[PDB]
Amino acid sequence: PSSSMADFRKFFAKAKHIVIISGAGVSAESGVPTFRGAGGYWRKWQAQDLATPLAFAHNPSRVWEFYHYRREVMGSKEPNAGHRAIAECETRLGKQGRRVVVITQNIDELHRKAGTKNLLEIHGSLFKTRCTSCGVVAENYKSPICPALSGKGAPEPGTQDASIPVEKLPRCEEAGCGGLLRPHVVWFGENLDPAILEEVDRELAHCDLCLVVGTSSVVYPAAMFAPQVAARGVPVAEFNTETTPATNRFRFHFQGPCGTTLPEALA
Amino acid sequence: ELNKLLGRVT
Ligand SMILES: [Zn+2]
Numbered sequence: 001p002s003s004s005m006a007d008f009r010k011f012f013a014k015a016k017h018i019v020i021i022s023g024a025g026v027s028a029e030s031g032v033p034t035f036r037g038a039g040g041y042w043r044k045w046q047a048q049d050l051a052t053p054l055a056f057a058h059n060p061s062r063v064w065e066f067y068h069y070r071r072e073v074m075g076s077k078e079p080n081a082g083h084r085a086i087a088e089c090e091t092r093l094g095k096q097g098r099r100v101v102v103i104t105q106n107i108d109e110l111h112r113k114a115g116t117k118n119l120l121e122i123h124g125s126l127f128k129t130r131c132t133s134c135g136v137v138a139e140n141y142k143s144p145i146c147p148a149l150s151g152k153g154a155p156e157p158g159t160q161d162a163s164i165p166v167e168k169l170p171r172c173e174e175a176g177c178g179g180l181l182r183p184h185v186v187w188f189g190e191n192l193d194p195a196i197l198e199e200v201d202r203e204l205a206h207c208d209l210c211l212v213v214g215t216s217s218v219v220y221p222a223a224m225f226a227p228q229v230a231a232r233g234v235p236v237a238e239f240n241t242e243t244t245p246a247t248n249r250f251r252f253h254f255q256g257p258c259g260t261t262l263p264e265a266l267a
Numbered sequence: 268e269l270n271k272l273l274g275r276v277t
Contacts, residue, residue: 188272192270220273221271221272245274
């Protein structure tokens with residue numbers, strides 16, 4: 001792939017429907033832990049170990065400690081220069097009748113905090129719950145999410161399981177329900193939301209320029225979205241700290257922290 | 268239906 005910013009900027013000046021696909025690389029630049037690399041653990045586990053219907057079925061306390069930790073950590077995190085350039089570009093182009101859509105694998109809401117309005121959160125959100133009895137999905141920014149979790153969730157190896165009984169984990173507040181809540185986060189082995197997938201398929205079919213930003217952690221189907229666009233002849237620009245297994249299918253590859261490359265690219 | 272699945276081949 002090319003690293004000609006001048007060539008990318010030519011396409012950028014004319015594009016009417018831009019899809020930006022973001023992965024954890026963009027969150028790591030704001031210091032948000034991801035729990036996925038070689039070496040990236042919470043206690044003795046990684047995200048793929050805890051973000052699973054198996055972990056929740058067998059140890060819902062532990063899975064809640066882990067998402068509690070992640071919610072509380074966000075308290076003190078801010079969107080970075082890459083989130084901002086993406087949000088500013090959306091705003092600016094929309095005044096020109098041009099469309100920018102962000103499809104994000106991230107669940108941390110930093111794009112939303114930066115001002116991105118056209119945001120498809122394909123793996124859900126740290127700050128949503130879903131009731132496992134009635135299925136209602138609700139916003140929840142409470143700190144702590146329930147009292148039994150106050151002080152829990154510490155990441156250090158050695159840390160004991162809180163072992164909170166299911167009755168004192170987060171519970172649905174809908175009148176007449178009382179069911180156990182779960183994070184409204186898509187786990188490994190589960191279906192993505194069919195409504196969101198329809199949007200994603202439609203946006204990808206219309207777009208005339210695709211950006212792929214901080215997607216070194218490979219997850220399906222998201223890792224297929226940009227190859228699908230490139231396979232139609234549409235230019236794809238990858239902004240990442242390293243190459244990925246799909247890099248050789250894209251038109252552009254710009255190496256470096258997204259925070260350094262995006263502000264220039266999207267000016 | 269389309270599932271979330273970890274990429275392993277690399
Ligand atoms: Zn309920």
